[PDB]
Design a protein around this ligand. Sequence first.
Ligand SMILES: *[C@@H]1O[C@H](CO)[C@@H](O)[C@H](O)[C@H]1NC(C)=O
Length: 49
Amino acid sequence: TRLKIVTIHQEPFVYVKPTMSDGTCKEEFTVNGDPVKKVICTGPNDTSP
Ligand SMILES: *[C@@H]1O[C@H](CO)[C@@H](O)[C@H](O)[C@H]1NC(C)=O
């Protein structure tokens, strides 16, 4: 039922954005007026140092 998915930070394929207030995403529109179906991914900010 639940499948854990991993991906790498690559902008033209996986856009990664900081949240607005707390775990939420600003519903942006395309040039065709399509709201982009986003997802709440879990990632670190930078490397361990
Ligand atoms: C993540 O790192 C960037 C660069 O230092 C910083 O601007 C941002 O505030 C960090 N995220 C948080 C909320 O800790």
